[PDB]
RNA sequence: UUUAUUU
């Protein structure tokens, strides 16, 4: 719908930035927003972020390819965002 | 803040209650956490306690290291970087 | 075997 679908990415590095998210997700389809969550005191990435994709089937393709992807030396976890 | 204490060789079913019961008697404790596998939610075998007072943390460590928890011998120490 | 897990 209008909100799109929100994807949660875990196991980003301390120097990860929005550019790394756009680059990873952009290829699978329309991406409308990205955000890296950063540590209040250090300004480093706390290790996770969010990407909003418009179309469910493109979001599902992204998650299938990127969940388990090795970025630097860490195995990413990616899935649709849950509440909290 | 306080002094962070590392506890290794916790079993799968270990929880915060067991850590509170062990370390509580030695002095002020402000946090306990058991580390769990994100998927299975089973304790991965270690946890942490934060105690406020350096000398009380020392006493807990010297007293509890080698403590037998179920079938397992615990390793307790000041947390390393 | 030394805690970033959902803005």
Residue numbers in the entry:
A (entry chain A): 240 to 323
B (entry chain B): 242 to 322
Give verbatim excerpts from the published study on this entry:
HuR/ELAVL1 is an RNA-binding protein involved in differentiation and stress response that acts primarily by stabilizing messenger RNA (mRNA) targets. Hu/ELAV proteins share a common protein architecture with two consecutive RRMs, separated from the third RRM (RRM3) by a less conserved, flexible hinge region of variable length. Here, we report crystal structures of HuR RRM3 free and bound to U- and AU-rich RNAs.
While in the structure of RRM3 with U6 and AU15, a uridine is recognized, in the case of AU6tnf RNA, an adenosine is bound in this pocket. In RRM3-AU6tnf and -AU15, the ribose in position 1 forms a (water-mediated) hydrogen bond with the main chain carbonyl of Lys285. To summarize, the core of the RNA interactions with RRM3 is formed by three binding pockets with canonical aromatic residues from RNP2 and RNP1 (Phe247, Tyr249, Phe289) that recognize a U–U–U/A RNA sequence motif. The affected area correlates best with the dimeric interface found between chains A and B in the structures of RNA-bound RRM3 suggesting this is the dimerization interface in solution.
